[PDB]
Amino acid sequence: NQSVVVDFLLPTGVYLNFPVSRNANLSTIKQLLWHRAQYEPLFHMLSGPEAYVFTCINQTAEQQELEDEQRRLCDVQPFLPVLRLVAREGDRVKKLINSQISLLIGKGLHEFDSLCDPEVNDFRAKMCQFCEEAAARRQQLGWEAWLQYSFPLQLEPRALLVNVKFEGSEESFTFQVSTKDVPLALMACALRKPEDYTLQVNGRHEYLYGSYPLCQFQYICSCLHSGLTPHLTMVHSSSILAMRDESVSLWSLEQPFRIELIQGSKVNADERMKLVVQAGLFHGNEMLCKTVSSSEVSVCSEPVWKQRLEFDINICDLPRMARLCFALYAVIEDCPIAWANLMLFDYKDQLKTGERCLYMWPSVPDEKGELLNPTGTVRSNPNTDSAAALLICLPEVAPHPVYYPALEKILELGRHSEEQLQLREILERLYEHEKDLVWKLRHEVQEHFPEALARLLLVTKWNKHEDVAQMLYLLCSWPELPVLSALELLDFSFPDCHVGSFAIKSLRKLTDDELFQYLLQLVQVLKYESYLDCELTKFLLDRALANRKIGHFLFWHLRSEMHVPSVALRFGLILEAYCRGSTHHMKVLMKQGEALSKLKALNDFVKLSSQKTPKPQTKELMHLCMRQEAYLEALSHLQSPLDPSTLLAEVCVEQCTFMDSKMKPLWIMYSNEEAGSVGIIFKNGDDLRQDMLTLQMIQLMDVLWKQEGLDLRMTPYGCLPTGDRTGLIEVVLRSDTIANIQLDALLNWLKSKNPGEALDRAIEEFTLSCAGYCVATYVLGIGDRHSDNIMIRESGQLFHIDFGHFLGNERVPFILTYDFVHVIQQGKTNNSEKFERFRGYCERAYTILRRHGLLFLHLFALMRAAGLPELSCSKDIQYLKDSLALGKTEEEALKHFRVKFNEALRESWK
Amino acid sequence: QQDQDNIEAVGKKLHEYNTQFQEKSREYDRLYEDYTRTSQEIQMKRTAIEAFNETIKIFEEQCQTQERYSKEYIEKFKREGNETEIQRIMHNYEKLKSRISEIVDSRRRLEEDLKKQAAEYREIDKRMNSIKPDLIQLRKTRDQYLMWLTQKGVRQKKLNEWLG
C-alpha cells in the first residue's frame, strides 16, 4: 500500500486526520496540511508554515523535532503516523544532535536517564564535556592539522609519469617524476602555467602530504607495482576550510565481611529439586577466601533465605576491586541456574551499604563447569521485568560512610617498609615456594627485572591489605614498560585500577597506525572493566577524537555489539560521547547506517523470494526494490564503512546480484567516474567476528613481514561487523574461486589473464602469496581449506575466504596442494630452483612470526573477552605457542617446520 | 586400599553416551536461540510500549491545550451569534478524544502480548534448567569413559571412530 493516514496536532488544539504518501517529504506534507487546515477552525490564529517544526515519537520512543524537512516520511519512520507542530525557537542544535545520536547508536538516550544511576550521569557529564571541548578545540586549528585529523596518511611500512590537474578544470597536466620526490616538490612542478595546497587521489578521500617520498604512499605504491599512471587533483587551502566547516579509614574495621541473603525472585526450576545460592569473593581470577553456601530451600518462584553469610576475610583486607560473586543452583537432596557479580566498592571508592537487588544472568553449561563465574560482567541484567533476581543486603559497617584509602595513604604504608641465583632461573626462563621467593625479592624485581612486573602482580597476596599497599607503592615508581608488556597488563588477571592506569600510560606512545592493529582487542578488553569511567575508555576516546579513521572503526566495533545486553549500556555511553566530539563524522555514519538498514530489508526480501522462485526472476525483483527513490538514494553516495577514504558513489543496479550461500549474501556494485568500480558484499545471517579477527591477524603478519623486507603479495581485504549477525566484506575484483576457475586449468587461466612475459610475474605473485597464506593458515590452525574457499586474482595473487573455523577447531598439519606446487614450479614435474625459493619464503615468513610470538599470544589472550566459540581458554592460546614453537630454540623450531614442510610435500601426491 | 567390563563393551557405551550428549547439546542450543531471540522481542515490546506512552502523553497535552485555548476564545463566538463555529470546535475535539481510545486500545493489545511473551520466556528458561543437569551428566560420563579407555591403552584412532 502507498498511502498512510497521518494524525496532525495543530498548536491551537485542533486535530486533522488525512492520508499522505509514504514517499512524501515533510516540506510537502506541511503544504498539504496547511491547505486542509484553512478549512478547519481557529486557522486565522496560526502563524505561517515556516514558524513551526513537525514533531513525532521516533522508533526508539523519543520525541524528535523534525528540522530537516527534505526527509521522506518513510525515512523519518515514526512510531505511529502522528505529527505535532511546535515552535522552531529553542536551542535546537542540542535537540538535533540528541535525536540523531539515539537513532545512530541504536539505544535511545532517555534509557540512560531512566536508570536513575549517578555513575551513568557523571560519565555522561564528564565524557561529553571532554569530547565537546576537543571538537571545539579541533575547529580553531589550521587546515593542515584539520587535514591530518580528517584524512590521515595511508602509508606503506626509478621514475614514472603522473596525471595532475586542479579542481574545476577539464585540462590535465602529465609529466615524469621520481619515486623519492617528496609531495611538495611535485606541487612546485605542477605550478607550471605551493604550500597553500595539497594533492588528492581523485575519486577518493586520500591525500598526499608531509615529508615522505611518493613510494611510501599506498596509492603510488599500488600504481607502481601494477605499472600504471596515478591520477591526482590539486586543491587549495581555502577549499579545505569549506570541508572543515560544513571521614573514617577502612583499615580500622577488623570485623569479618558478611552479607544478608534475603530473597530470590522470578526463579524457574524443577519443583522436586531444592535451591542453593553459592557465593564467594574474588580479585580478578583468584579467590580472596573460601566459598560459602546457603541452606537447601525448596524450589518455588520466590524463595526466601534470610541468612547471614560470613566470609573468612576482614573488611579492612578487601582490595579496591573486590568482587562478590553469586551462583544459584538447583540440587537433588547439579544444575547451575543463574549467576550475578557485584563490586563491593562503588565508582566514588565508597564501600557500598544497604539492600541491593542483583538481576541475575543465566548460566551456560561450559566445558570447565566452575562453581561461580568471576570473569562475567558486573552490569545487572537489562531485562529487569522478566529476569531472575537476588535480593541481598550489605550491612552497615559504621555511622559514617567509609571509602577505600587515597594514594597518599597507600604510599604511606610503602614509607614504613646469593639470593638472586634462584630468582633469575624463575623469571629468566609459578608454584608455592617460588611465589614467596619473588615476593621477598620484590624490590630486586623492580630494579633488575622490570619486565617481570606481571609475574609479580600475581604473587602479591591481594586478600591481605598490607601486601596490597606494598605492591602499589612499587608500582607508582615502576619504570615505563614497552607496548608488548603493557598489552599483557590489560588482561583480566590484573583487575586493579593502578595496574590498568600503568598499562594505558605505556600505551600512549602508540602511533595511530600501530594502534589501529590492536583496536579490536582494546575494544573487547572494556568487557572486563568494572566501572563506566575508566582510563581505557578515555584513552580510546582521546585517540578517536584526534584521528577520524580510528574514530570511524571505534564507532563500528562498539555499534556492532549494541544488541548484546551485557555491553549495550557501556558501549552506548561511549558512542554518545564519540558522536558529540565528532558531529562532523556523525553525518557520514548516519548515511551508512541507513544504507545498511535498506540492505537488511533488501536481503530479507531475497531470502524469502529465493526459497519460492528461481534466481533470474529474484535478481530482477531485487532490482525493482532498488529503483525506489528511498532505496536508491539511501544506497547511493556514501563513504564506504570498510574504508571511509573509499567513495561508494552510484549504485549499479544491473551488476547488483546475490550469491548462493545459505544466508544468501548481496553483491552490491558501485561506479565513480572521478576515480574505478568498487563493490561490497552485505552478509546478514552469520557471525562475522571470527572472520575479522583472522583477517586482522593475517594483515598483522603482512605488516610484520613487510617491515623485515618481505612482501608476500597478500590481499588484506576489508571485513566489518556492523550489527547483529550483520556485516560487510570488501569485494576484490578480477578474482574468482579456484573451484570456478577449474570449471591444468589454473595455469591456463593465468596464461589467458597474463599473456606473454606477464605470466612470469603472475607465477611469482602466486608463489609469494601461496607462501604467506600457507604459513598463516598453519600458524592460526585454519583447516577445511578447499578450492571453494580459496581465490586467485588475475594478477596471480592467491588469497583465502570464509574462515569458519580456526585454532584446530586436533592439530591442523601444514598443507601443500599439488595443484599449487605445479603452478609454483611453472608447470614442470621437477623445478628445484623455483621450489627451493618457495620453501625459503615459507621458512622466512614462519621465522618472522616466531620473533613476534608474544604479541600474537597477548592479542589472542585479550580476545577471550569476545567469547567466540573457538577462543575461550588457555588451550586455544596454547595452540599458537605450539604452532610457533615458542618453547623451542630458533633452529629447533625451524627443523620441525622443515619436517612439517617435507611431509606435507609427500602428502600432496595422495 | 584405593576405593573409587571389556574394551569393546565400554567403547560401545562411549559411542552411545557421546550421541546422547550431542542430541542434548543440539536441544539446549535450540532453546538458547529461543531464549536470546525472545529476550530481544521482549525488549522491543518494552520500548514500543514506551512509544505508546509518549504518544498518548502528546495527545493528552493536546487535550489540555484544546481546553485552555478554547476557553479564552469560545465566549466570542457565543455572544457574536456563531453557534455553528462553537459546534465545529467541539466536534473536532470529540474527534480527538475518539482517536485516543484507539491508541489506548492498541497499547492494551501490546501489553497483552508482552504478558504472554514474558510467560514464554520464563517457560523456555525453565525447560533449559531441566536440560542442564542431563547435559552436564552426559558430558561427564562421556569424559569418564574416554579416561577409562585411554588408561587401558586404546589407540587414538579407535576412540575417534567411536566419537561420532
Ligand SMILES: C[C@@H]1C[C@H]1C(=O)N1CCN(c2cnc(C#N)c(-c3cnn(C)c3)n2)C[C@H]1C
Ligand atoms: C557476481 C557474481 C555473483 C557473484 C559470484 O557468484 N561469485 C562467485 C564466488 N565469488 C565469491 C564468493 N565469496 C566471496 C567472499 N567472501 C568472494 C570474495 C570476493 N572478494 N573477496 C575478498 C571475497 N567471492 C566471486 C563471485 C564472482
